Amino acid sequence: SVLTQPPSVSAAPGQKVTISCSGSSSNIGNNYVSWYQQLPGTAPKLLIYDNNKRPSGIPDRFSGSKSGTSATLGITGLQTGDEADYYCGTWDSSLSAVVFGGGTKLTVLGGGEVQLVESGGGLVQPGGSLRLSCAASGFTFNTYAMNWVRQAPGKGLEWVARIRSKYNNYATYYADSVKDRFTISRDDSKNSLYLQMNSLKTEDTAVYYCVRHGNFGNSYVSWFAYWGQGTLVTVSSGGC
Amino acid sequence: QAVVTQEPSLTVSPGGTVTLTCRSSTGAVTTSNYANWVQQKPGQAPRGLIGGTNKRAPWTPARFSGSLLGGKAALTITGAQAEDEADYYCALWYSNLWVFGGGTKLTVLGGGEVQLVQSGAEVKKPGASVKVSCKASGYTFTSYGISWVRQAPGQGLEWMGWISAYNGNTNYAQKLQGRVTMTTDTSTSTAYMELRSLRSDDTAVYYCATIDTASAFDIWGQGTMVTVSSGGC
């Protein structure tokens, strides 16, 4: 690749991690640098533009800097949900093209912020099956009910399934659209929520979110307070 | 089944007041529907903002307020900021279930509020062509520049080129010049990418994305997998 970045780095929650990108005068040296975060099977997400600016919604713990022909992404107060692949991108004047680094895969090694980390999404054929996982941290998992909510590309939100805590007999509830095909479950000892998705249809194509309730003042509890980053499930025959 | 309806899109100038509404197909929205508002900023995961008609989440700014007005739930933003640009979803409680509305895409005049929807996965034989679509819903399509980026399995991002939705001018990556064609359709707010003479190494996820004042891509499509194989279907 045109831009050079280390293939991988590991860091602990609450610590600071830096990711550097090396270029030349034609690219980083004379152009604005951008940084992207990418979770498995999902689209890159803009973290930094114009070397150091954050789009709204990007936490203040993400920062960017540029010095000569090199650029750096800083992540302070690391969270479990920061585990991702990070790419630097810039315009190359000599090539008259957008160039990217090869990406740095960051591994993040109860505590911290409320985090809902999703995995298991992917591409499957109609009639196929997938299992989604949500690894929770930053709260006592076993006292909370959890919900799965999906969002089909370019469409609205649709509630999928609910599982109560141990204190409410792990009671499960399903939307009619997924009844008898999906199963919501949890493993409290692993701080994990699951969605088993069988007999998949093209209309199940969506980003799936795990969602945790939160206090909205002292008189109301919203089921929709905290959301995970989402995992994409695509169900397609591939035009076959 | 109950249907919850919202304005598909609204625009507000910074400092302005905007009122979003949420209608129930069953009749007047009541406090017993415990109206919730969820905010989804461009390229972000959603977050709860209002619950129980008017209760704020701890992170909800004072400038947002929930209420009931003329039989509908209402979300008012007093003194809109660029930060408030988002898709706003309302959800109403109907006895044992939350029903969401279709969302209101709120653009804050300045890079507007859009969602990009790409066509489905494709299986192709070597030598064939593939045409990927990317439809924008929300703020005026012609205000956008669209870029195409691909990623082979387990590999890095690769820029393919870009086009203006205002005038249709293009720039293609050197490696693809003569094999790739990018077009847009104003009437349908759709950008197109055609890649010809497909070979094994074209197997990748193809993404479209909007372009910044700064040549950064803020809004991305969900991606389209293209599999090029000897066997095909």
Numbering used by the authors:
A (entry chain L): 2 to 110, 116 to 246
B (entry chain H): 1 to 110, 117 to 239
The article reads:
Here we describe the discovery and development of a potent anti-P-cadherin/anti-CD3 bispecific DART protein, PF-06671008, capable of redirecting CD3-positive effector cells to kill P-cadherin expressing cells. We showed that a bispecific antibody (bsAb) composed of variable regions from a P-cadherin antibody and variable regions from an anti-CD3 antibody had potent T cell-dependent cytotoxic activity on P-cadherin-expressing tumor cells. In cancer, bsAbs that co-engage the CD3 epsilon subunit and a surface antigen on the tumor cell trigger T cell-mediated killing of the tumor cell while circumventing the need for the direct interaction of the TCR and MHC class I in complex with antigen. Oppositely charged coiled-coil sequences (E/K coils) were added at the carboxy terminus of each chain to drive heterodimerization.
Crystallographic studies of the DART protein were undertaken using a version of DART 35 lacking the E and K coils, replaced instead with poly-histidine and FLAG tags for purification purposes. The purified coil-less DART 35 demonstrated CTL-directed killing activity equivalent to that of the DART 35 construct containing the E and K coils. The crystal structure of the coil-less DART 35 protein was determined to 2.0 Å resolution. Missing amino acids in the linker regions were not modeled into the structure because of the lack of electron density, very likely due to disorder. The 2 Å resolution crystal structure of coil-less DART 35, arranged in the VL-VH format and separated by a 9-residue intra-chain linker on chain 1 (CD3VL-P-cadVH) and an 8-residue linker on chain 2 (PcadVL-CD3VH), shows that this DART construct assembles into a tightly packed spherical structure that differs considerably from the previously published diabody structures. In contrast, the DART 35 structure reported here shows that the disulfide bond formed between the two chains keeps the diabody in a compact configuration and reduces the distance between the two domains to 5.3 Å. The two antigen binding sites are separated from each other by approximately 30 Å and are facing away from each other at an angle of ~90°. The anti-CD3 CDR region is positioned remotely from the subunit interface, whereas the anti-P-cadherin CDR region lies adjacent to the interface. DART 35 and its optimized derivatives, 153 and 154, which are presumed to share the same epitope based on near-identical CDR sequences, show binding to all constructs that contain ECD3 but not to either ECD1-Fc or ECD1–2-Fc, suggesting that these DART proteins bind to human P-cadherin within ECD3.
